[model samples]
Target: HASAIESIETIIVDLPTIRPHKLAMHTMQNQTLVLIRLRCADGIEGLGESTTIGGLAYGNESPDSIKTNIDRFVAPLLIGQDASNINAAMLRLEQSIRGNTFAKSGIESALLDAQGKRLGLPVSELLGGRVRDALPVAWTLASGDTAKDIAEAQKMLDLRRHRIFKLKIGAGEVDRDLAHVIAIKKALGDSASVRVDVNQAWDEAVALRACRILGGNGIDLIEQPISRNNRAGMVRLNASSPAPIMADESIECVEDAFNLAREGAASVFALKIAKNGGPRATLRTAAIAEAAGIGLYGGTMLEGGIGTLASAHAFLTLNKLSWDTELFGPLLLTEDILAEPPVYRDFHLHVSKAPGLGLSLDEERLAFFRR
Candidate 1:
């Protein structure tokens, strides 16, 4: 029987973080995700997750807003529709809705998961087939303390878990931030690649100076050094930067990607499924980046199991992920709601070959963590 959407359920889960993840905008001690379960008339079920970095700190969407928007607005439009046509379904929602990209991302994930399951293929194959079975994962060193962060990075290197380290900067003075980052780089030496994310927290002058110092200190990349809307500033900084500059908050949609590319704003693009609307839309962004000769990176919104795996499936389709990925979102959590959580080993996230995102939700764990 051809599958048709029967129902959609949104559950909010609040899980504690292993430690405080301090970023430029906000600090996260816990993570709240809106998990969407889509059921089809043919008895196939799909799972999706929507998460933000720190509630309203990162952007406008939060767990409450995602749940309310999906339950009150999106679910009604999707129910009784054909589950196989993911693009059409997403388009219908896009036309009817406006600017709830995070919420819509979860819905698109559910549709893709449903379609992949019905066809008995992994979600990556449904997108464009896998270019690689695994992705190199990067870990964020946001301890806010140089000694602790260096110690953490050393442990990760010792375990062979991750060698690419991204430090969270911009919350303090630029010189202080520089000292901290340079110290970490010197500590780790050539044993690891060190980068920093300013998270749109610097002025053009500061960014230019920081980039030069970072480059001299062996830093590989600088991410979103200035405001997201300041294309001219980014262009200027990119021109002077000794290291590659990546756009994270700036490249939210395809139009943004095109604009940044046209301006020669940065050398690398941080691709996030939630920021771009969904997996397919994110691919469109990737196309723009590729055509512009810019590098590609799989960015994250600090999502849990479902959203992280959904991103993995989509990014696995890319021909060249030059900057690798930060899909270590699931690892930052103290608890996982999946029956079999994602495995990270040898610094790569091994994509599951199982159908439909290859994840099973633990209902008991879900209920226990229900917020």
Candidate 2:
């Protein structure tokens, strides 16, 4: 029997971050998440989250924008569709909607969750089985204080929580940002792997000089240096820069991934579910990256719980993740709406073995945090 879709509801959640997360686009004092509950006629409900960083500053989708898109158009198209048929349900949305990958990503994830529950399998297994159970997670040191970032990274290393550190630069002047990052790298001194995410904040000339300096200072990766629109700049940057360049904002969809790869714009790819569409769609980007011999880094849109796990399952199935991951989004949040939070130990994230995404929201917290 088909578990037909009964209803779809979007819940907007406002959760405080542990600190003010400084980024190139905007500062995040708090994170707002848009979660979708896909309730089926068979009483099987699936949960998915679509949360963007720096609100609209990071991507085209904001929390409320995606919510409105889903409620007004996306849900209507998939309301009576078969919940088990994720492909068909998503296709219907694709035929109707254009470039609303953020809204479509969560909807597809919810559909996958419901289908996984029906089959009594985890989403990772549903996505052709996981190659490994645990994923090495990297943490971002974005406190905007050079000493504080070094101290914070020290604690993480001491706790065995994370050894890979991604420094958020480009918000400050080039000289200061360079000094801050290089200081942190020197402080850590091979105890941690240090990288920088410029988030498309620099011009080609500035990036050309900055990338050489960072790579000379032992920075492992330099991500999204120039504008996402400037593939020619990226291609030249990849060849001229000393550090390997990774594409983040450049990939908005699977097709974008192929085009970026074809142009040799970046040697590393930061795979985000919301940015690429969904967990299943992200794998398509991952496959394309691997096919082109590009390194993989499991990037996050800074999702709280459900979205993080959805990303985890997909990353678990990958054959190579040379740059590891930065899936510590939940840890950055001061609170969670999940029944049980994810586990982080030995610098790795443990994938849940339970059916579906293996998560459910805490009703009390959801109600309290919902906007």
Candidate 3:
């Protein structure tokens, strides 16, 4: 007999304070994260988050707004629904209220988390079980300045935390950006691996030219060197480029994966759960990449523990993770929002074995940090 999900409830816990998080391209200076909590009648609850870049670049969803949407609209339709029917609940939520997979993901994850807790299994165990146990993580030297990046890298190295570092490139001219990266690589020597996220800053000609120039300097890979919308161009660039091209902004769903694979534009897929609508959608995209014979790796959206663990859970279920992940959202902040911070070691993080998502929200800290 299947366990019936009796009902679903929603809660929005805000962070303590708004803080400016600086990276190379932009600054999420002061933004709040919406912690989504889904409750079931069976005395189980699960958690997820609806976090996006400030100004809601992709859609109308925001951390603060998602809470209100879930409480006012989503919870009503799901009140008497069975939590175990994850897909059904999601469709109902999507069709009836106009869809927001980001918010829906948080709610869906909570429902799944509750179910996993009820069954006393990890979320990965519930998500078709794990194909791997540990995920290799990447540390971002995202202090916005060259010197700060170096100091942060040194700290990460001293703690035995990260050996792979990603630099946010395309801030200044190509020469200066390359110099900044080369200096960091030189400073760290052979102990660290390096990559750059051009973040759709350069045109195809500039991107290809930069890749050729950077190839001699040991830049491991290039991410979104050109805008994602240029799928055909990306394919062309990848076919002849000196370094591997990874799709970040380009992959929003399965169709995006199909285009990338079909076009032969990219060798790697950087799967970000939110960007793909949710964890399950991301997995489907990963499957498309696999079917097309492309590599896949987990990517993050600067989420705290909630989204981080969700990503960790998804990463474990993948058959293979080609590139190191950057789930360093928790480390970038001055104060952690989770009741328990994620566990990291030597640029790798162990998936939480605890039932469900393996984390809890610190309401006090969260509220204190609320903008």
Candidate 4:
């Protein structure tokens, strides 16, 4: 007999960031992590994390809402269900839940964690085997200051931690934004790959000219330059941009992936586990991206260890990740909540060999941070 899901506990943890993270939409002073602990009858606890950027800054679910929804609705639906049958459990949730992919991601991650723990296999092994043991990680240079950002990139490069830097622009004046990016590209030059994420701050008209200048420079890729709602603009921009246009915010779900691919919206797709449903669903979107002849990049919502690694396990299974990954969320946080956080070395994050996400909550740290 399979152990039943006993309870799903949601903890809202408030942790400080190493520095103020400036995204295009909002500046984050601190990070809020929604930690999921799904306890089962077999004396196992499955861990998952649901975290967002700047607390709904990018239209993703907020920490308070994810906690409330899971505690009040999503968790209730899974109580006493077959804890080991992750597929059936997820299907049950898919039928009832419409949106809240962030909320659903944590729950689905916990299900996989629980099953993987029960079978004594790593989450990657459970996810059809991993093609890689480590993933290349890209760091976000969000200081919004050219010199400071350059210094930060230098430090990461010196540490041999990250050579790829994703600049967060589009919040300032367009000319200044381009100037800042061009300076960083000049600073690093061929030693690093520079990219920019506009975060949908530019309109179609603005992006048309901006992408040209960005591509003319050595910028490797441009992400979500125009609003996600402007599908036509994306199609037009993708068709002409010298550097590849990557669809991040636009691919909210599998259907979004399909539509973007069919319309030739972008040549690259940024895959996020929370945006899709969970690890498995992220792979589904990845499959669509591959079939469409699109390159894949591992995107993030800037989650902590649990959420980051949940995505890492899935990304590990992928056949290719042409654009590498930005799974450096845990590094952004000043605190450590897990007993063993994901390892970042030589610009890559090493996948865990331990079963079920290969992480454990530091109960004392968890107690200290819970709000």
Per-prediction RMSD in angstroms? Answer: 1.0, 0.8, 2.7, 0.9
Q: How high is the lDDT of residue 290 in model 4?
A: 99
| Total clashing pairs for each candidate | 0, 0, 12, 0
Candidate 1 local accuracy as lDDT?
Answer: 0.92
* Candidate 1: tens digits of C-alpha lDDT, residues 212-307: 999998999999999987879999998899999999999767799999999999999999989989899999999999999999999999999899
What local lDDT score does residue 351 receive in model 3, on the 0 to 100 scale? 81
Q: What's the distance in Å from true for residue 112, model 2?
A: 1.2
Lowest summed-lDDT stretch of 10 residues in model 4?
52-61
- Model 3, position 4, has a per-residue lDDT of 45
lDDT per residue for candidate 3 within 136-191, as digits (tens), equals 88887655678888888888888888888888887678888888888888888888
Q: Model 3 compared with the native: what TM-score? A: 0.90
Model 2 / residue 361 / CA error / Å:
1.3
Global lDDT of model 3: 0.76
TM-scores for every candidate against the unseen true structure: 0.98, 0.99, 0.90, 0.99
Residue 2, candidate 1: alpha-carbon lDDT: 59
Per residue, candidate 2 scores C-alpha lDDT tens digits across 1-69 of 369898999999999889999998888899988989999988899999989977678877889899999
TM-score of 2: 0.99
